[PDB]
């Protein structure tokens, strides 16, 4: 019991340094966040030891494109123009304890988009996939979800709604 569904993660972005509310990444198909340490090991006849190299960190994902949108168009501008982007990963079902009562548990990143591929095939909705390269230590916190996007603008049909 209490297993954790993927679709309860909310991924948000905004262009770094401009005063605007973060924009939600709609229609994610799959997602992943990776951290990996580039450790060497040094041998000696007294015995080998392992040396603490630096860590590379990256976020990756796939989404379906749609007509009421302008955000994949921002990702493909950002990868070419080397624009710095802030991003959040927020857990839509862990609320903050007190004072942060209206916020949800999150990681904050800033970094650059490093990949964007469109994939189009006959008999299919075209996908895009991207990679984002994190700068430094990602920062823990609690994040406000943009309530007008997440709960006010509900829609009927197969779009998820309460």
């Amino acid at each position: 019991a209490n297993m954790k569904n993927s679709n309860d993660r909310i991924i948000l972005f905004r262009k770094a340094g401009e005063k605007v509310d973060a924009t939600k990444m709609l229609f994610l198909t799959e997602y992943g966040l990776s951290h990996e340490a580039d450790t060497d090991t040094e041998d000696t006849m007294d015995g080998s030891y392992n040396t603490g190299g630096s860590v590379e960190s990256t976020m990756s994902g796939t989404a379906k494109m749609f007509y009421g949108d302008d955000f994949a168009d921002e990702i493909e501008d950002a990868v070419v123009d080397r624009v710095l982007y802030e991003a959040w990963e927020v857990e839509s079902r862990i609320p903050g304890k007190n004072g942060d009562s209206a916020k949800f548990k999150a990681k904050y990143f800033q970094g650059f988009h490093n990949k964007f591929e469109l994939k189009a095939e006959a008999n299919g909705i075209d996908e895009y996939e991207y990679e984002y390269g994190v700068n430094g230590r990602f920062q823990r916190g609690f994040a406000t979800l943009p309530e007008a996007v997440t709960k006010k603008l509900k829609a009927t049909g197969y779009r998820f709604h309460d």
Binding site: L12, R14, A16, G17, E18, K19, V20, D21, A22, E86, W88, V90, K103, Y108, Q110, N135, G136, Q139, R140, G141, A143, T144, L145, P146
Partner: peptide, 12 residues
């Protein structure tokens, strides 16, 4: 960098 909230009131 530190943590910044999603909203325009906590812009970078």
């Amino acid at each position: 960098y530190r943590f910044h909230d999603t909203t325009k009131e906590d812009a970078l």
